[PDB]
Amino acid sequence: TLPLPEVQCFVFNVEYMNCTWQSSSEPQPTNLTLHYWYKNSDNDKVQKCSHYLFSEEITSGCQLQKKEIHLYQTFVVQLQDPREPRRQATQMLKLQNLVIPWAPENLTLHKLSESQLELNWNNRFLNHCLEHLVQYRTDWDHSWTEQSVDYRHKFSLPSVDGQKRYTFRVRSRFNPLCGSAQHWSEWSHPIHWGS
């Protein structure tokens, strides 16, 4: 046993991918190299990284472009020690479970009655693929009230106390229609429904 750092991959709004590892957990700083290919498919050829991320003059990650991304095909990566080959760690990743989307945008509120208001927001690209968490609170609440929301990007508030002051926010996630991603986006810029 002579372990190699676990590699992490995140696909950022399906625009690109960061793969990283923290290397410093090994005597002798080492420029570790990364290769990848897609399993049981067309172009099951091995690929060098060609775009290395560094940390203190020692490789630390690898950024892949959209062209190189194929969700829905099993992505196989391998960390390789340059001096001793006989020590390599490979993993099979499901890229469609590692998408983080960007934060919801253009948060807007509008009344559909004196006492009823509705909240809308935008997401950069994916849409039919995302689900969301809405969180709101007043000046009176000791915590948030959340509620998950399907592909509609609407949230009803059928009963508002016009006297309280409301703080709204949303985050999105690539699940469960086009992927089974588990990590959420950053929160949106919050908005308020005033005194």
Partner: protein, 204 residues
């Protein structure tokens, strides 16, 4: 004439047939014959209006999923002519295009204050196929008014609770709620829940 049927999204299809004037001892039936299942179902039409007959087609356990988005059932209305079956009306029934779920159930007060009330319910017999693509609508009965003047409160998401604001202290209210899936071109709202009776709290 007119022949309307709805599907509760599980194992229950209910029918309503209205005719412009049958004669004495008019024995009718609805026959369901699906286009890719191994079974048939029938039921005896029973009078409801002066000229309305109604029927329930029961396809299995209350919570069993007995049909799909791709099923097409040929519903037929049949009445006894001497010995032989005369077809009154015939329909290509797309069960997930004619949805009406059961009333929501188990209405209960989670918390009452003096100006506020959090009520919650459960949906009775919904397909798992819906996921979160449901929609709710509620209404509050307050002392001075009747049900039909009460604002329809809109939940454009699957939220199985509501938090009523700006209520009068120490006052009796009544509460009602209903559901609709987003899917189905002829899909309607459920009937309304049993009204939940509740009372706000006195102030100082």
């Amino acid at each position: 004439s007119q022949f309307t049927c709805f599907y509760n999204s599980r194992a229950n299809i209910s029918c309503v047939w209205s005719q412009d004037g049958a004669l004495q001892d008019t024995s009718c039936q609805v026959h369901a014959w699906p286009d890719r299942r191994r079974w048939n179902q029938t039921c005896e039409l029973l009078p409801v209006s002066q000229a309305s007959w109604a029927c329930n087609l029961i396809l299995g356990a209350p919570d069993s999923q007995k049909l799909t988005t791709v099923d097409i059932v040929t519903l037929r209305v049949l009445c006894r002519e001497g010995v032989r079956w005369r077809v009154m009306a015939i329909q290509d029934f797309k069960p997930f295009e004619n949805l009406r779920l059961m009333a929501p159930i188990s209405l209960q007060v989670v918390h009452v204050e003096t100006h506020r009330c959090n009520i919650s319910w459960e949906i009775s017999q919904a397909s798992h196929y819906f996921e979160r693509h449901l929609e709710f609508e509620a209404r509050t009965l307050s002392p001075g008014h009747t049900w039909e003047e009460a604002p329809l409160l809109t939940l454009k998401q699957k939220q199985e609770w509501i938090c009523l604001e700006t209520l009068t202290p120490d006052t009796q209210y009544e509460f009602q709620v209903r559901v609709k899936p987003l899917q189905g071109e002829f899909t309607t709202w459920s009937p309304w829940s049993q009204p939940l009776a509740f009372r706000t709290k006195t102030g100082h």
